Amino acid sequence: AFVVTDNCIKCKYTDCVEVSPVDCFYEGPNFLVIHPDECIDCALCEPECPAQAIFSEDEVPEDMQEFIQLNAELAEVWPNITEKKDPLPDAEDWDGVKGKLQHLER
Ligand code: SF4
Numbered sequence: 001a002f003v004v005t006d007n008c009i010k011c012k013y014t015d016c017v018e019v020s021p022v023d024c025f026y027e028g029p030n031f032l033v034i035h036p037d038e039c040i041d042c043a044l045c046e047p048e049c050p051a052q053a054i055f056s057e058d059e060v061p062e063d064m065q066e067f068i069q070l071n072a073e074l075a076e077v078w079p080n081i082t083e084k085k086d087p088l089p090d091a092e093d094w095d096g097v098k099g100k101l102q103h104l105e106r
């Protein structure tokens, strides 16, 4: 399973969803998560995230380990997304800000 981590919060470019062969991504207000039972680890998405937020589960940084379980839990409540859409409005101002998990909306 690939894991979407912090920097996607408040950026949500959705460039990642075009490349996906299965419907692995599930959509929230300002973040996207990958459903771990459905990702087939094709690795195609992580070169596409402008925010460089997608990691192989085995490569999620020490300080971002929360995300592995977050992606699994939210993937069970959030709707599947399959079309790219426009990035959230202020996406570049937040790209690269650390500590964005305090801003996650459900
Ligand atoms: S690695 Fe592939 S199957 Fe997995 S979330 Fe990315 S695009 Fe989807």
Ligand code: F3S
Residues within 6 Å of the ligand: 004, 007, 008, 009, 011, 012, 013, 014, 015, 016, 017, 031, 032, 048, 049, 050, 051, 052, 053, 054
């Ligand atoms: S910022 Fe998020 S919506 Fe996808 S393209 Fe990157 S993981």
